[PDB]
Symmetry: C3
Subunit: 72 residues, 3 copies
């Protein structure tokens, strides 16, 4: 697994672990469930690029302790 | 204190700090309270072994930044 | 940004990132919102000193991976 941070605009940082070839939608759904948020209302980006349903950490060239940004 | 991670099957990783000779039930109860979960429905394991009410990090040979796995 | 930990008496550790010259009330409000807590009922301290509305990490001489303590 690699460890990823999900950072909100409020400064909150929530941690996940995910395998490099697993879709990031695993993480996005878990974030929403754990944080009581809706995909209808939030968006996830990595180094400015939107993350799609099937993108994986390896495809997006993510490394351990990288950060995903969440926006409204 | 040592720092411990509690990892769910969804990839969520939640952090605790606990003294080495304090029972892990402190951590288990705090996890349940903070995550809105019930002991009735979840179980905690460390390197495949169930964690009991009075087990301590020192007894289970846990070290800083180790991970506890949570299951349904 | 620097990374800060917010530690509860239950051993929970929640992470934030904040710029050094931004008021810590950003973090305090985010903690309360994310944790479903009220400022009416909790207090934040750093190395024994209460944190006020306009105190910044730089003013309080905080560094990456320092811990803020939360109390009832």
């Amino acid at each position: 697994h690699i460890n990823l941070k999900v950072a909100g605009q409020d400064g909150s940082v929530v941690q996940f672990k995910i395998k490099r070839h697993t879709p990031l939608s695993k993480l996005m759904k878990a974030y929403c469930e754990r944080q009581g948020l809706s995909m209808r209302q939030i968006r996830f980006r990595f180094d400015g690029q939107p993350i799609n349903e099937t993108d994986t950490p390896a495809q997006l060239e993510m490394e351990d302790e990288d950060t995903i940004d969440v926006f409204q």
